[PDB]
Amino acid sequence: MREIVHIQAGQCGNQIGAKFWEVISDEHGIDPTGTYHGDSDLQLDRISVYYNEATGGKYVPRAILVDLEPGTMDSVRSGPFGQIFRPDNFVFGQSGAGNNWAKGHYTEGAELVDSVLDVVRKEAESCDCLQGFQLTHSLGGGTGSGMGTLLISKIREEYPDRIMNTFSVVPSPKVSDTVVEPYNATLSVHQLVENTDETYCIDNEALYDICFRTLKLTTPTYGDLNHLVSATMSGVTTCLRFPGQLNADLRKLAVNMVPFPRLHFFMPGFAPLTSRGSQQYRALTVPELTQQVFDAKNMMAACDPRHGRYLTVAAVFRGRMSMKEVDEQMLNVQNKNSSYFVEWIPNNVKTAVCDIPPRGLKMAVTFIGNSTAIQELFKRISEQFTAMFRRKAFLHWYTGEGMDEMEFTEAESNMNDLVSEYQQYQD
Amino acid sequence: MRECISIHVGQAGVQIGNACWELYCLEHGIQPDGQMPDSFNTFFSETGAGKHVPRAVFVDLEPTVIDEVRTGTYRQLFHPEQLITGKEDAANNYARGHYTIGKEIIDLVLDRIRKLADQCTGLQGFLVFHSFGGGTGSGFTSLLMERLSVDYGKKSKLEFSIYPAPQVSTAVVEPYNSILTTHTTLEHSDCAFMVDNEAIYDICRRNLDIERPTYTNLNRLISQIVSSITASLRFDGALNVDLTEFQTNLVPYPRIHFPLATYAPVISAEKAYHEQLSVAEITNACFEPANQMVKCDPRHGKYMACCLLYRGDVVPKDVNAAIATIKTKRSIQFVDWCPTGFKVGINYQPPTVVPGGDLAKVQRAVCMLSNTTAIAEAWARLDHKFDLMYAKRAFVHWYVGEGMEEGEFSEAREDMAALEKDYEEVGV
Amino acid sequence: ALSTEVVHLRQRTEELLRCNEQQAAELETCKEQLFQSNMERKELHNTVMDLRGNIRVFCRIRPPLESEENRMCCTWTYHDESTVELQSIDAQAKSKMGQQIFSFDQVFHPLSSQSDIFEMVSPLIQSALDGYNICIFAYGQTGSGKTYTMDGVPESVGVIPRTVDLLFDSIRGYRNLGWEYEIKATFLEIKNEVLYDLLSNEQKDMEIRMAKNNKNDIYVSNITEETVLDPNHLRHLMHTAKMNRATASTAGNERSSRSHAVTKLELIGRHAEKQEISVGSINLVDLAGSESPKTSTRMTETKNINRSLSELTNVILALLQKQDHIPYRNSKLTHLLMPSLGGNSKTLMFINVSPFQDCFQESVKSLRFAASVNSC
Amino acid sequence: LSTEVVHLRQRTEELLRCNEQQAAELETCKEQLFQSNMERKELHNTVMDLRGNIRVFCRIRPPLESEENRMCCTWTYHDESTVELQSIDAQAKSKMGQQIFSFDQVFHPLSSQSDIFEMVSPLIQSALDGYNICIFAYGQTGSGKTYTMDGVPESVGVIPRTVDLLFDSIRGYRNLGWEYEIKATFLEIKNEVLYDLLSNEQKDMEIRMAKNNKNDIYVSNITEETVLDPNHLRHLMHTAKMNRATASTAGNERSSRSHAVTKLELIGRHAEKQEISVGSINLVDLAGSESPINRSLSELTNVILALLQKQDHIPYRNSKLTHLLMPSLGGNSKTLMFINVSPFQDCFQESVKSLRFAASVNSCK
Ligand SMILES: Nc1nc2c(ncn2[C@@H]2O[C@H](COP(=O)(O)OP(=O)(O)OP(=O)(O)O)[C@@H](O)[C@H]2O)c(=O)[nH]1
Ligand SMILES: Nc1nc2c(ncn2[C@@H]2O[C@H](COP(=O)(O)OP(=O)(O)O)[C@@H](O)[C@H]2O)c(=O)[nH]1
Ligand SMILES: Nc1ncnc2c1ncn2[C@@H]1O[C@H](COP(=O)(O)OP(=O)(O)O)[C@@H](O)[C@H]1O
């Protein structure tokens, strides 16, 4: 039934996945134990896509947890919704990547990749018709980058039919949390553009702006950012897990979004983002959802769309609404911002009206835009990378791990090629 | 009994058929269970027990919507082996639905329809409901259509496909699917009734005065259309017309077989009181370009042929008078070489309004199956969008990556250009 | 006659030494002039190619067999040596497709044999000696004559033996110029979008990698590189590679007629006296069958082949339209041939067409994009 | 002492052996040189053929110090091969339509002699390949044709640069075993009567087909000075322009209405081999194009237009200048034609008169 396998690499990915699984379980009325207690049989109808059946009316997430240090997984297991996982799935090393991509893709990855791929196969064969894999990680750290790329390269070469979802947390432009995240990101995207086929670029600075300004939040704990990302991620597949007027799936939008194999990096966006007390003042209808979801103020990525053109846009809707409104408003925004859309793709909007809204909510929209504004982010990263490359800053930590600098040259050239593609299709 | 069977591919096909069959079982007082607490035998293979199974084959490559109908109020209505489901949707791919999943379920669906045909005594024809942008509704539909034309050839194959809207394209890749399925269907389609979502949207806006129209309402409208089409079979009228006479009356040439539908008395209940709903006025209404079910201007193209289906309390004298008046009209253009095309389908079974519906209780209704030159520009702009996509070779990797060649894209493109050429050369 | 003999021999030695000095000076001058003339003709010939080409599309049709000529065949109208007209006999095909006229650099008659091929190879090998990376593409459907033109038959060899002999005589002639040419033979197969080796049976892992010297220069790790010593050595290597590529071609059409064999001959000419080195490579690459995938048995790799062909078409049309970036990395075949496709590199594009009705759609497909290439 | 004799004998033997082998290698290299040079020339003429056949060029010249108060026109330059001119008279601007002309190359008043000689120089090499070459400067009076051809001692014209390049190439090719002889004939056509520019001995002069080539033309009674060095040909040109009787001071109708034909025949022979070449360079300075004799000019225009039309019959013998250049306008040859345009409002109609000839030239090819 088009089941999905969830992988979590790096501690960032692990925390994000913890949030994601708790929100999903909230959607389907699953207790920490795993005993179902919801009411709508629609939760059961597609419960298989994320939960394997368990004896005695329990359910376990079809999830894999990967790290190179135990501490995060210990926190997860200790935390609520920790016992929900099947304990066999927790795969972890002992060394730790140390924010070094070379380790996590050549030594610790080398020694742990089989110990995780075995349980990957075990989960895969426990499915009727495998739909695809969603990988949650970050491009900054060591394990979530090196291990993530290694797992992608592995999975692709023996599951070429399936689809890969990578919600890479792209490095921030200004508030850098790692002195060497240029190297990690540049090495990662080299694998990313080759194997996966849709990547959701997320930035922490953009999410800070979201929560602080739009949400009027003052304590932007990582819990809240992860909650936002998880809401987007559940909204991506709600069409798969639920009936609707236009049921879409990962396959459905995969072809819609990407005109060309390499250009598969998207900017997510979640519409209804009323602040703490402004919900009273604002009516919740399709116009608000659309106009809000099309604001540069609302993109989870830190790129301004107005600097480039939307190659392709998808708009997945939850709740009860009349698609007439959504048709006319997509037409409207296509007309007004015609400068913001590529000309040679008329009517470049994809609509996926589903039925069930998120709990406590009436209407919801998830935005996925494959705009050309990403090329500015890639230029920024390339500039940072080459800035600390020919000075060979921190190079020894990588070189002594079993890689050559021509690998850095390769990744840099490849990412420059990506930039060339985007700037070229800008016209 | 010259019975007919119906096919439903894709989300659109299945939703439409759901609305249709609910309307049908409403016509004959059939419970959702399948018993009536004669006429209906054309569409219901009623068994010895009071279980009137419909002659419907629902096919889809994803189990979602079909499972929903298997959970709806009509699960026990349908024969459980009728509802055929795949496992993964074609995802807007003509390629998937025609090469990689289509032939993996087509044997089963062909077998089931073969069984159904053997069940029928006098096989009248086939009804298929699908889309164009739909990956299934394009690839799978074309595959099944050519397969049937191989199997029977002689029977009547009627498409109720949904033409993509001129302004809104829900799927970014619609032009590719449309061009491919049209090229592969042209030579296997007897007559394809086209309809569009934008036009019916305008209709429910300015006539029903529905402000938030859902797919349910559009499906109600299409159900009314098809009910009018089949009334002559399911019921007795002054002039009954079967599906066989449609090919003869409408298409002048084998390729030019794309009529567009229209349904006149579409007023709301509150406005029903302010109008008498005369035969002449609804006849005029069905010629109003604002009332067409396809976003095209009949005023800008000559008509090839017009088929009019009247149901309810109608008098032939009035029909003849109204037709004469419309003949006297000036904006109503006609090509010379066919100067008399108005085949009439008077029937005296009034249409029935679904409870909870939007339409009003009307004494008489007419359905207009116009075929006109005014569709050439629709093909022109579709081909133009296709050329825009193909110039940059956008998305081509998905298709060539799953069964075809860009050379085949060019084949379909030039085939469509030839179609438009022939269409305009007939137009003069 | 002894005392005067000493004087006579001294005079003779003086005269012979003077002749030695003159011949040496004029020999150095003539070597320099020969090199200058060679490079002048290099630039002139490259200008000729660029004005008349740098993307050369050649079309050839094989003659039907004695039994297949009685099989129905279409009318072939050769308006000139550069345009060929294909018209399907079917009336409905005539009505819908209309006239199928096409423009190319040069049209081959079915009786043209291998002579025109050789006289197009001669400027091709000449430009290969210029130090230019040249790639050859044998495109077409199965049975259309691709194997007949590339490999050939014992009575009439294909392009490859003629090129080998021409290159060997050219390098042995240029040895008189003091040019030492090192020629490297590389063989690889592209199936299922993963590279293989033709010289080695053992299963190793290939990966595409840019060379140490330059980013634009590309090599493949872990390949069997053979230094060619004599022509017969190269012939034996090619025979072993053709024997290693043993699979269904027409009986089953499984992998052969569906594979991409890349034959790259890296030539490195060196001249120690003036310390100048010329680098070049020829790429004798045959394409896969362009037929629509109908075998449900193994349709996936056929779809991959279609991806490869479409990407090659996209790459070449990007070359024509002066596109800033050309998607070399979308496919393995394009990515490993990027040095031979961009810049001063020159491509011959060869197409074979079948003279029967069942290939009418495929013949038209083969011709149309090539004619579009000719237009731009 | 006999030991020295024996040593000298063996030294003579080794020296003769090494000399013989070195000479054999030398001759083989010379043969390779010749085989390379012939292919070089073939490639050069192939380049000439690929670049075109008519080679339309426009050379707009700046106004002089005495022309600063005149009214110019609106020169609309497009890319580098298309030019458009408009009269500043707004009343006639809407009555002229599209006065746009696209040629092979466009020369603006900032272009020096080197810019034109860049295009001209490969034709000297082509003439060295035994092919006839023609250079034409066309335009109205005052356009600049003489400046293109003769020029000034400060900025020399096309002819001196062609001579210098010719001699440089001759002395470069002397190592290639070939010897060349330069034959220079200076001639002027005024009213369909041929005038020798290197002698004041007035006689009767006629044109006859060559004794060894019925397609080639040799003119009787012409003096044919063999040029030894650029100084000799410069002296010959000096004497010719002295003999031209430049009547610009009194009776300008004589100089500004006469065609000036400068023919430079290149013949190349090769001993120890076979080589026959009769390639000639016809540096013709055409007369004024002003409307009114014009028999030669109209015949030249018609002949060029018919040649670009692949006409079955070419009217070669209907004028003195066409029949003079009958072997110089063959299919295998390469023709160059320059349009000199005065950038003045009073010359606007003469400008379009000069430009519509090339407008018909490129539309007929
Ligand atoms: N009139 C009407 N049209 C509908 C309705 N539902 C869907 N459609 C149209 O039908 C198309 C639905 O796509 P499908 O035919 O189901 O295609 P699919 O089966 O999902 O396969 P893919 O196209 O690859 O996703 C859309 O283009 C809609 O415009 C409906 O309820 N009423
Ligand atoms: N949204 C979010 N991002 C995080 C969280 N924790 C870490 N990150 C990001 O992840 C990056 C750190 O890399 P990480 O993968 O955690 O290091 P590694 O696990 O050792 O490879 C930093 O740039 C953080 O911004 C979290 O809880 N939420
Ligand atoms: N580019 C130029 N720069 C300066 N003076 C020029 C230029 N072109 C032509 N002239 C002037 O034009 C005169 C040459 O006359 P010209 O126009 O060639 O006669 P014709 O009318 O026969 O062509 C020279 O005296 C020179 O001063």
Ligand SMILES: [Mg+2]
């Ligand atoms: Mg003059």
